[PDB]
Design a binder for this molecule. Structure first.
Ligand code: VCZ
Ligand code: VCZ
Lengths: 413, 412
C-alpha cells in the first residue's frame, strides 16, 4: 500500500518535572528544574551526586505491587507512560483491531539497577540467589512485551536501543510501520532508569557528567560557556501514533501530524560528534526532505542540547548549515536545561514537548543560558518561554556510535 | 510498488566455526558445538555447558587497544559484520556511503562487561569502573563502531527483541531497502551471555537444560527427553542489497529476501500459547508479505529451542499454517547443534536458511531420538537431507511473545 499519513492521538510521560504530561509541561513552561541531590543511594564516593529523579512515582497507580516487584524501574516507567498514552488516545482495543496495534518502546541500557542488584546477589551470596525474573524483568524489549500482554496488542512488537537516540528512533520507525501499512496504531517512545552505581559511576568514569554538586539546578546549561557535561535523568515518554484515516474514522483528538523522520550516522567517533555537526546536518536534511518542506518552514527546534562542550556547539553548527539565514528566525531550545538527560527516553519526552509546543504555540526555554558561548548567537529562548507562531517543530537526538535521529511534527487542522 | 532485496554477503561466529563455511560444514555433518564452559567456575550453577566461540582472535579485526574498549558481544558482532561486507565485495564510496546502513542487534547485550565492572565497583568502588563501560557495553555499538570503521552514513540503529533480535534486525533492514531508505544494510545480531548473570539468570528461570553429563545431547528439539535450551554465543551478519544495485556491480547473490512477518502473542512473558497462535499469525504475515501460498514453502528453520512447551507450540503453528503441506516440507532446528544464540539465533539461522537454498539440503535436527507426541512432521532427524528447496522460512520467538519470520527464495 501507498505511504499513509501518521498523527499523534495520545501521549504519556514520567519526568523529573512530573508524573504525567500536563504536570511536566507546566514545569517546562515555568522554567522549573527537576534536578536535585539523589536520595535513593549513598553517592559520597561519586564525583556526581545529583540528577533528575522521578519524584513520588507510585507504580500501584498502574500495576499490582506483586507484578511490579518483578520489573526493573525502566519497565515500570515505560508501562506507566504507555498506559497514560493509550488512555489519552481513547483507543478501544478489540478483536477487530488488536492485530493492527503494536508497540516500540525502547531504552538506551534497560534494567541496569536490576542487573546491579542481581550482580550483588551473585557475588556476595551466589547464583542460587539470582531472581527467577532477572531476564524478563531486565531486558529492553519487555516494555513492548508487558504492554502487549496487558493490553492484548498483537501488532509489531519490538524495541530499539540506539543509546541517547532511542526515543526519537523508536517514534520514527513506529511511524514508518504505520506509513507502510504494517500497523494502523503504534505505542512508541522510550524509558530509562540508569541512576544506580554503574550508571553514575560509568558516565562519571567517562567524565561525561556535570560535577556541579554545589548547584544541581544550574548544572544543565546547554550552550552556556561554563557547561561541564550532561545531567543524568530518569523517566519515560510514550506516544500513540495512528494512521490519519484510522484516527479520523473514530473521531480521535489529533495533537499534531508526524510528517518527517531522518536518520544518519556520523561515522566519526564512539562518543563525540564532529565539530561541524555534519551527521546532525545530514539527519535534519533527510527529515526535512522526508516531510516535503522548505527549511524556512521550521519555527521551533527542540535541540538534543545535552550541556556538553563538544555536543552543544556541533548542534549550532548543524542548524547553521541546514537553515542558513533562517537559523536566525527559528527558535531553538534545550528542555534538558530543566529535565536533564533522560538518555533513551530523552527523544520520547522531547517529542512530546515538541507536540505541545505546536498545541500551545510556545517555545520552551533553555534555562541557565547566562553566557551563550562563542558562535551560540541563535534565538536559544534563554531563561523564559517564548509565545510564538510554530507550524513545524523539529526534535533532534544524537547518540553514542554517532547515531542521529530527527522528527518533524506539524500542526494538524 | 517496493524494491527487491537480495543477500550478497554473510558472516558468522558460532560454536561450530569462526566463519560461515566452517559453521555450515559442521551443520551438514551433524556436529555439536556444545561443551562444558571453560572460561569461569560454574560449580554453584545447575548448568555448566553451552556453545562457546572457540579460538576467536579479535586482532584479525581490531587493534588490541580498540578491542579492550568493547564487550565480547560487540567484538562478535563486528567480526560477523566485517566478514559479511568482505564476502559481499561492496565498495563504500563518497557516492554511496549515505545509502549504506547497519542494523546489528543483541538480546541481552553487555552482561559480561557489566559483571566485570560490577566486580570492580563492589570490591574497590566506582573509581575502578572503566571509562569505556557505557560506550563499550551498549547494544548499538556494533552498528556504531561498524559505521565509524567503514564510513557508513545510512540508517544506523539496533534492535533488541530478546531471542527474536536477529530475525527482526534482518527484516526491518530489508524494509529500509524495499522502501528506498537505503540501498545496502548490514543486519543481524550478536550475543555473549555466558557470564554468571546469563547462566544464573536463565537457570533461575529453570529455562536451561541441566544435562551436564552429556552436553552434546542436551539440545534435543521435539525429543520426548528435552529439558530446556542450551545457551550459546556468537554472531551472524548479512549484507542485504537492493536487487538493481547488486546486479549493477556484478554482486554474487545467495538468495532473495521476499517476506518478513512480525506478530505479538500478547500471551505471557516467557511461554508461548500452546497452539502457537502468534507463531501462526507471524508465518502467515510473512507468506502474505512475500505473495506466496503456504504450499510454496519447502524448508523451515524452526526456532526449535528444546523447551517442552515451545517446541510443541511451533509444531501446532506449522500444522495450522500449512495444513496438508505440513507433511511435505522439511523442518529442522539447527539449535540441536549450535544451541540457542539468543539475539544472534535469528541471524545465524537466516544464514543457514540461505545456505539450505544454495546447497539444496535440509540441515538435520540432531538428538531427535524419540519424537514427542504430535511431533510427526519431517523434522530431518539425525542427518542432513538433500531435497528441492525453492523457498525457506526462518522463525524466531522471544520473551514478551515477540515473533519474527523471514522468507527467502532461490534467486534466478
Ligand atoms: C556522538 O556524541 C554524543 C552523542 C550523544 C551524547 C549524549 O549525551 O546524548 C553525547 C555525545 N558526545 C558529546 C561529547 O556530547
Ligand atoms: C514466548 O516464549 C518463549 C520465547 C522464546 C524462547 C526462547 O528460548 O527463545 C522460549 C520461550 N518459552 C518457552 C517455554 O519455550
Amino acid at each position: 500500500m501507498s505511504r499513509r499519513r501518521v498523527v499523534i492521538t495520545g501521549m504519556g510521560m514520567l519526568s523529573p518535572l512530573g508524573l504525567d504530561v500536563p504536570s511536566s509541561w507546566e514545569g517546562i513552561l515555568a522554567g522549573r528544574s527537576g534536578i536535585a541531590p539523589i536520595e535513593h543511594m549513598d553517592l559520597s564516593a561519586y564525583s556526581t551526586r545529583f540528577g533528575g529523579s522521578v519524584k513520588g512515582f507510585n507504580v500501584e497507580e498502574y500495576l499490582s505491587a506483586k507484578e511490579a516487584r518483578k520489573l526493573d524501574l525502566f519497565i515500570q516507567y515505560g508501562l506507566a507512560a504507555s498506559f497514560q498514552a493509550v488512555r489519552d488516545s481513547g483507543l478501544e482495543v478489540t478483536d477487530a483491531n488488536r492485530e493492527r496495534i503494536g508497540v516500540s518502546m525502547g531504552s538506551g541500557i534497560g534494567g541496569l539497577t536490576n542487573i546491579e542488584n542481581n550482580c550483588r546477589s551473585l557475588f556476595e551470596q551466589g547464583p542460587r540467589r539470582i531472581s527467577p525474573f532477572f531476564v524478563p524483568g531486565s531486558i529492553i524489549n519487555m516494555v513492548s512485551g508487558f504492554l502487549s500482554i496487558h493490553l492484548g496488542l498483537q501488532g509489531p512488537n519490538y524495541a530499539l536501543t540506539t543509546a541517547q537516540t532511542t526515543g526519537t528512533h523508536s517514534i520514527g520507525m513506529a511511524a514508518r510501520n504505520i506509513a507502510y501499512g504494517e500497523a494502523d496504531v503504534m505505542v512508541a517512545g522510550g524509558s530509562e532508569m540508569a541512576a544506580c552505581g554503574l550508571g553514575l559511576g560509568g558516565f562519571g568514569a567517562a567524565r561525561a557528567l556535570s560535577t556541579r554538586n554545589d548547584e544541581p539546578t544550574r548544572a544543565s546549561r546547554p550552550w552556556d560557556r561554563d557547561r561541564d557535561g550532561f545531567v543524568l535523568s530518569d523517566g519515560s515518554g510514550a506516544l500513540v501514533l495512528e494512521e490519519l484515516e484510522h484516527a479520523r474514522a473514530r473521531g480521535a483528538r489529533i495533537y499534531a501530524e508526524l510528517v518527517g523522520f531522518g536518520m544518519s550516522g556520523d561515522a566519526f567517533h564512539m562518543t563525540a560528534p564532529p565539530e561541524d555537526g555534519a551527521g546532525a546536518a545530514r539527519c535534519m536534511k533527510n527529515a526535512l526532505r522526508d516531510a516535503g518542506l522548505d527549511p524556512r518552514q521550521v519555527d521551533y527546534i527542540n535541540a538534543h542540547g545535552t550541556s556538553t562542550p563538544a555536543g552543544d556547539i556541533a548542534e549550532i553548527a548543524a542548524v547553521k548549515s541546514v537553515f542558513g539565514e533562517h537559523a536566525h528566525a527559528l527558535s531553538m531550545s534545550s528542555t534538558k536545561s530543566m529535565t536533564g538527560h533522560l538518555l533513551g527516553a530523552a527523544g520520547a519526552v522531547e517529542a512530546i514537548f515538541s507536540v505541545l509546543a505546536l498545541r500551545d504555540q510556545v517555545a520552551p526555554p533553555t534555562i541557565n543560558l547566562d553566557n551563550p558561548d562563542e558562535g551560540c548567537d541563535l534565538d536559544l529562548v534563554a531563561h523564559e518561554a517564548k509565545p510564538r507562531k510554530i507550524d513545524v517543530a523539529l526534535s533532534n537526538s544524537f547518540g553514542f556510535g554517532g547515531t542521529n535521529g530527527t522528527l518533524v511534527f506539524r500542526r494538524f487542522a
